[PDB]
Design a protein around this ligand. Sequence first.
Ligand code: HEM
Ligand code: HEM
Ligand SMILES: c1cn(-c2ccc(Oc3nccc(Oc4ccc5c(c4)OCO5)n3)cc2)cn1
Ligand SMILES: c1cn(-c2ccc(Oc3nccc(Oc4ccc5c(c4)OCO5)n3)cc2)cn1
Lengths: 291, 291
Amino acid sequence: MNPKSLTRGPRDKPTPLEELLPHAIEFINQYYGSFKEAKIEEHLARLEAVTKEIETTGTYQLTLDELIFATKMAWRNAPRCIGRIQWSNLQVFDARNCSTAQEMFQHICRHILYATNNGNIRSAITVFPQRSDGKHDFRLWNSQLIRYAGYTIRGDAATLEFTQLCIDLGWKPRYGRFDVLPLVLQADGQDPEVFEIPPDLVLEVTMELKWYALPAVANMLLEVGGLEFPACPFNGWYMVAVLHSFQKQNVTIMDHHTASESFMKHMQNEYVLSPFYYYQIEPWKTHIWQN
Amino acid sequence: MNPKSLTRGPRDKPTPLEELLPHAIEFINQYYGSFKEAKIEEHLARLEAVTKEIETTGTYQLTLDELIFATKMAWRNAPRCIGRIQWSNLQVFDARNCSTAQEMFQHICRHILYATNNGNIRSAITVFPQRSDGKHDFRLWNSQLIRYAGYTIRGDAATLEFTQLCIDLGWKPRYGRFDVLPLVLQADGQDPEVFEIPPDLVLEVTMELKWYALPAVANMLLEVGGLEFPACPFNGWYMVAVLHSFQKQNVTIMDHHTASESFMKHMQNEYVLSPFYYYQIEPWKTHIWQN
Ligand code: HEM
Ligand code: HEM
Ligand SMILES: c1cn(-c2ccc(Oc3nccc(Oc4ccc5c(c4)OCO5)n3)cc2)cn1
Ligand SMILES: c1cn(-c2ccc(Oc3nccc(Oc4ccc5c(c4)OCO5)n3)cc2)cn1
């Protein structure tokens, strides 16, 4: 067998042009190929413009239309995602001009607000700046946007390490079993900063014990045309008393009705794999602290 | 850290009385507190009248005097606004009895006319109806009242998405690089309607290439005493050859003379932050089309 690695690690220098160029061209091809017989001259013009941009700047920038296409195709290319059957139902937030952790925080608040939608969950992805030389990475250190702290264990067991990490960074822990972890945000390669999520932004389902309604993956990397975006949180909705509690509180889960309706909406939008979502190495294992 | 979200999203039901009430009371307090030792009996009477109005109607209405105060304090509370140093220089237009998109259009024409003032720019805000149940929102889909369309890019790059949106809505594009976008106006929660701004209302500075003289933010939400106003466009004036072109054409910018004179005028008027201007989620990402 020759499976590929599902992890894409850090770099300490820009991607070499001889490597980036062919990848960029292959992506531009799959983008314009999605127009069948249309836009041959547009395809060539874009090829020419990207090549000169790479040769002059060392990299290139996607158009927002190309970015939206990439995020949806990477979702389609996700092997284990049940949700990928309706891949066209995705809202993209473009945060590629983001510069600070405080700005990252506001983008994430926007995402949580929109996606939670008072329970009527919507799928969304927020895309922060692509990797340049790999020393200025944007990253979310969280594994999910919303998750409970873990501390005889109290809270979520799978967060024990991250919870201690937040505490080390100055986060003041309560010791409940449903404490929502803070956001730990790294911008432009700097040391992470800690941001409490405003409680009103966290919708929870009461089991009739409780659980948060928004499942959002915070820690993966989007690869597209040789470009890498190491910060790109996305969310879908969840797939017992839980089955009853979510429906009774009007929070979306993937029951048969939702499966049918979301596929129907997808279907109306018609009126090595790449692009791809990669796992990364946990950033606290690779980060060089500056202070 | 525990920063607050700078975005305030949609609702699908009225604000609960147990939430609105304390907010209303706190605002009434800051309003009457602006009178120091004066009007204690007036303060109590207003508290009593607002409470009964909330308990009987589910909401309450600001007096125009309270509204003027709120708009000026929210401006004072705007962290990044250089202009907030002279917050008392603000003309308020009360459009809270507005019902249709056509009426919205006429209010906006009035605003542009008054604020442009043939180049001698005046700061103004126009306040449309507050949010009720959140299904009848007034919104301007534009980010600014005046902005050029973007389409190899032709025009403003940051409007490409909105420009395509107008085109989708039946707007017939020229393909110049200084096409003024139409107003896209939603009234009472209905689908937006498209209105060309009368060309004579748009003052432009010629660079001695050109640019519009009136910078007006169209898309923010004013919060005051628990009430939300999701349509409340405001304008100030602008902060190279541009510096020369504006002064030569007698269009106000914030040069030292204007800084001094506007502060002087402000100074003569003496002879979680709330109220506050929030960002919103772009309405085309949240709107449910009715037809
Ligand atoms: C509409 C809701 C969605 C549902 C019901 C859904 C469901 C799932 C499920 C059940 C898993 C496996 C979880 C596990 O094994 O622990 C998964 C994995 C994943 N999902 Fe989703 N998903 C949805 C939306 C999304 C979106 C919006 C994206 C990205 C734009 C996405 C990308 C992924 C990725 C990258 C993985 C890992 C795939 C792999 O390793 O093969 N999903 N999803
Ligand atoms: C007299 C002219 C004024 C000047 C020179 C001025 C200037 C500015 C500037 C330079 C910014 C930052 C723009 C950016 O970073 O992109 C700003 C932001 C803003 N301005 Fe003004 N402004 C003026 C009048 C007003 C008025 C009339 C209001 C409202 C009544 C206002 C409310 C705001 C708000 C809400 C923001 C964003 C504040 C933030 O995010 O912290 N401004 N203004
Ligand atoms: C969209 C979101 N995901 C996630 C996958 C995995 C996640 O981690 C996680 N932690 C605790 C509990 C769960 O439970 C699920 C199960 C199924 C599912 C989930 C979370 O989100 C999408 O579908 N997941 C969170 C989100 C996958 N696609
Ligand atoms: C009053 C008006 N504003 C605006 C802020 C931002 C706006 O968006 C925008 N778009 C393109 C170019 C600019 O340039 C500026 C720069 C400074 C400034 C501007 C616009 O308006 C007030 O002060 N702004 C428009 C208006 C802020 N206060």
